[PDB]
């Protein structure tokens, strides 16, 4: 409640912060332990764009 | 505002003229004598008391109490101010 | 009719002065008597601290 | 009994590890604790304990509500031994002026302050 | 010691025959302006206790001094010692010693009564008056009075 | 875990558990050097000592 | 790190304090 | 030996002597008025410190001028908020009134600093004091001392 807007019920992070740590945890499940960082590289670059 | 000058005593009243003197001069001083309670002011009378150091010296209680260490010091200063009877008024 | 004691004390009551502000008299709360401050101008505190004595 | 203790300048703001302790008894049926604590400024705070918990005031109210003495006269007492340690001279002042900033200038106007702001955690008679 | 004195205890045992020593709460003197010094007694000499108790008062062009001999006030310097003043002739070598009274003498004031009516001040709240032993005035401590400042503003 | 803490008195040792009264004792000392707590120490305090008796303060003495 | 109390990038109004209590209450307040 | 001498740390009073604090009250305008102080810095002889440290003493003077009355100048600012080189040194602050310095052998130096009559007090030369053992002419950092008298072998070498 605290990090989340009370009027349009969103959290208020940046949105590549949530995508960014989607995707880590949807590879997370699946034990790449590898493919953490190379997500971040990704969106970095693509945030760089 | 304006100082509270006073003289309210219901039971108290003031106190008139007597033999002490407000003449000074290069003759006479002044020496603050602080003594024990029990003492005795008027055994001393044929006894010498000192102005510088130390002396023992002789007194008159009972029996005899010449056992008194009487010191002598410069003023430290003191505020204790002698109020003396004045002479031009009684 | 005066008084001699520290001088950040009114010398007629004993009270407290405050601080000298802006103004040239610091002015006693209690009794109602003003100090001038250029009476202030005699003090010098000159304490020191010694570290390594020097034999 | 003056110690040092650190866990003292967990207390106030300006509180130092230096402090004296008194433990006082009255004819051996009464018993209470009470602190002297040092500020940085030079300020000393008054600890004492009433009912299991404790009170912080300062020094100068405690002075000036014991006696009907001037503030000189109370300044005169607590610069006794060290009479030109000018930093005690000027925190003396300081205490001593604490009390007049609050208007109460004389012994009456503390007694009516220190009863004023200390009748709720007391419970005398209204 | 080469320096003495013949002592002399002159001056009958009397109340006003002693000697009185002033001090000042506020000062040192340095300088006697136009001070009226005037010391007052009780009427009632018959009884020990209530004889022997004075009281100094001095007016100065601006403030006035009293001290008593009794009561709050009166010094210890009085009870556990006794004090003398001794005149010395420095021909006769004569010490005439006279009894002595020390007094310590406070400014005195008008008095106040206004905020003896004036006491009801939101006398509804009882333990929000409770705030008044929770500020800088005796505090309970640091936790307390950062504390209880607006409820933590919640 | 109680060593140290635990102590006991030696065989010499006593408690006082007596009361008197001490109304004489400050006026025994102000016959001997001690200056009453009013009075003025005709010394630097910086020069004298402070003398209590049972928690009351009863003057200075010259050193 | 990512999870406090911000202004939203979306309505664009003002961060709303959430404070909790006793852990027993939770207050807001009404942004201006 | 020369790299034992300057590994090191020197603090600033271990070669200060004492501090002189002389505080004086100076109202010499008729609405403005200050707290005159002056702080007279005296130093050990560098014959005391030539066996463990390696200054000369112009190099303390230098420290002296450069960062310590910054830092000084700073400490009295976080209290408040509720003939070339003399020069240069009395622009860092626009209260430091005088500067004095040891031109011949360099053993003192003596600021005044001047503040102005602020509502609260404190004790400048609790100040000086307290930053004079706080101070560190220089030191690499994270090393506070250094010892080469280990003779210790290894394989009787
Ligand atoms: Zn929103
Ligand atoms: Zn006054």
Partial sequence: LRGSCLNCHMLTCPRAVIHLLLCQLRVLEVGALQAVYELERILNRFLEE | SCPPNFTAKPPASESPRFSLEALTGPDTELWLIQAPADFAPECFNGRHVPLSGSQIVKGKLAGKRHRYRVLSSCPQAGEATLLAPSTEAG | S????????????????????????????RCGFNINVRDFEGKVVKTSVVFHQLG | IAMIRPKWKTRGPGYTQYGVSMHCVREEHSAVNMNLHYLENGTVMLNFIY?????????????????????YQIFQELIKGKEDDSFLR????????????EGCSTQKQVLNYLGECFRVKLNVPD | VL???????????????????????????????????????????????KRNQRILAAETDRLSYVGNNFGTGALKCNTLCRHFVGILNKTSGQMEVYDAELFNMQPLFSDVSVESELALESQTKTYREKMDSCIEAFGTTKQKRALNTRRMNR | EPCGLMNHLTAVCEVVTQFVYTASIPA???????????????????????????????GWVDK | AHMNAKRCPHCKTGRSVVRKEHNSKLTITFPA | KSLKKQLTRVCLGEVLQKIDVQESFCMEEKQNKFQVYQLRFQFLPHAYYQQEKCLRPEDIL?????????????????????????????????????????????????????????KINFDMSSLVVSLAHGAVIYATKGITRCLLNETTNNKNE
């Fill in chain 3, 2 to 29: 005066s008084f001699q004691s520290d001088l950040d004390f009114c010398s007629d009551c004993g009270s407290v002065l405050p601080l000298p502000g802006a103004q040239d008299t610091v002015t006693c709360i």
């Fill in chain 5, 3 to 49: 320096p003495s004195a013949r002592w002399q205890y002159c001056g009958a045992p009397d109340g006003s025959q002693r000697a009185v020593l002033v001090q000042f709460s506020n000062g040192k003197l340095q300088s006697p302006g136009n001070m009226r010094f005037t010391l007052y007694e009780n009427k009632d000499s018959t009884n020990p206790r």
């Fill in chain 6, 28 to 58: 025994l000392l102000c016959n001997l050097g001690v200056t009453p707590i009013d009075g003025a120490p005709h010394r630097s305090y910086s020069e004298c000592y402070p003398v209590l008796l049972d928690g009351v303060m009863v």
């Fill in chain 4, 51 to 71: 009912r299991k918990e404790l009170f912080f005031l300062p020094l100068g109210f405690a002075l000036k509500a014991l006696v009907s003495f001037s503030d």
């Fill in chain 4, 90 to 101: 000027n925190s003396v002042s300081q205490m001593l002026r604490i009390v007049m900033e």
């Fill in chain 8, 62 to 118: 230098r420290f002296m001028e450069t960062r310590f009355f910054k830092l000084l100048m700073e400490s009295i600012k976080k209290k408040n908020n509720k003939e070339r080189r003399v020069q240069a040194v009395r622009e860092i602050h626009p209260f430091i009134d005088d500067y004095q310095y040891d031109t011949e052998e360099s053993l003192w130096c003596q600021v005044t600093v001047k503040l102005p009559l602020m």
